[PDB]
Amino acid sequence: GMDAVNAFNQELFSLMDMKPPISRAKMILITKAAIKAIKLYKHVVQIVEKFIKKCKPEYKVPGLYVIDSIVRQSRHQFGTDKDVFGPRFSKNITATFQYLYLCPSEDKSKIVRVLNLWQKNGVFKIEIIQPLLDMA
């Protein structure tokens, strides 16, 4: 319910008081909270997109890593065909990446590395990935 959505909001926004790079352990806490709230996945996606819109530039790569971790965990746990998160994140993905590329110069390579992993592993189709690579 909305208690699980609130708990996800709390877990993700707590990053703003932590120094990047963000730990594997913290990412697991955020990802477990996302999956706990999966019956309200639309709210989870909205919260992650809000984080990426609002956060300081140092937190753009952490925000992208949250998308990566959630989408991969969901595909792993539920199957590539049944995952709700990838398709939902795909709706506003252009706007999301326009925000991510406001990161500091030394972080752009980290965004391109994730897009190349998504392409190679079929997390999204090339029709989605290529324009995001072109944006870099």
Binding site: S23, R24, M27, I28, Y65, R72, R75, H76, R113, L117
Partner: peptide
């Protein structure tokens, strides 16, 4: 504490 890596495998529900 080790940093998140996008090549690290997903966890199994422990």
């Amino acid at each position: 504490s080790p940093s998140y890596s996008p090549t690290s495998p997903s966890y199994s529900p422990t």
